[PDB]
Every structure is written in C-alpha cells, then in structure tokens.
Amino acid sequence: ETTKNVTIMHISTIYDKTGKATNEPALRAYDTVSVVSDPVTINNAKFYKLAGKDQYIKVGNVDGTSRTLKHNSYVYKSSGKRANKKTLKKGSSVTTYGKSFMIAGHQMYRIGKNQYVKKANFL
C-alpha cells in the first residue's frame, strides 16, 4: 500500500469493505491517521482505507466538501460566540467537514478547528 497522513476533521465511523458501519471505536476529530493515499469508491461513495486495516472512513470527514454560500455568513465557535468579526461573502466556496453539528441551537457545518457556519446559509 502507498500511504499518506491525514487529519480527521469530524468524528468518523469505521466502515467495512462493503460500506457497512462497524462498531469499532470511531476516529476523533483532529487525530492523525495513515490512510491509503487514493480513496476507494463503495456504492458511489468515496472512502479512505486505513493503512494496514480492512477499515474505511468517509472522505468527507477528512477532505471535506466544497460548498457555496448563498448568504453572507458569520463564523461561530462551538460556544455560540462569533469566532471573529469576519463575514464570509455570498458566493464564496467554503470547505465543510462531515455532517452538520448543533451549535447554539442551529445546524452548522464545521469549516475549521472550532469554526462553524450555519448550514442554512449554503446552496
């Protein structure tokens, strides 16, 4: 196997070679793991194979998904405070990692370490 090191950006279920979830302990955000460098496709979904193991994680939890903003947006911390006073502008492409989180009552995507943007603001 040719492998590379990646940072988990979102809690990640461990799947088997058929894309079925296992009960193996989930990988946790900001841990580093060795994966086979090229993703695999299972059921038209992309996964990283963990190096040396028949275990697979979703690429969206590592490389993310590029999404376009339909509204000007603030960036929040998990506490609910604004992370900064910057505004991400409508039409910007922003990478989001995994499934949205509930932050201060709103569904939000993680865009960075302790940085979140409201899901409703994306196209």
Residue numbers in the entry: 335 to 457
What does the paper say about this structure?
We determined the atomic resolution structures of all functional domains (I-III from N- to C-termini) present in the three S-layer proteins SlpA_ac, SlpX_ac, and SlpA_amy.
The general structure of the TAB domain consists of two cell wall binding motifs (SlpA_motif) which are connected by a short linker and arranged as an internal homodimer. Mapping of the surface charges indicates a large, highly positively charged region within the interface of the two motifs that extends to the C-terminal part of the protein. SlpA_amy_III NMR chemical shift analysis of GroP trimer and GroP pentamer titrations identified two areas corresponding to phosphate-binding sites: The binding area 1 (TAB1) forms an elongated cleft in the central region of the protein, and binding area 2 (TAB2) is located in the exposed region of the C-terminal part. The main difference between the two binding regions is that both SlpA motifs contribute to the TAB1 located within the cleft of this domain. To obtain a molecular model of the SlpA_amy_III in complex with two GroP pentamers, we used a combination of molecular docking based on the NMR-derived chemical shift changes and classical molecular dynamics (MD) simulations. Sequential analysis of TAB domains from different Lactobacillus strains (P38059, L. helveticus; A0A0PECX7L, L. gallinarum; Q09FM2 L. crispatus) reveals high conservation of residues located at the proposed TA-binding sites.
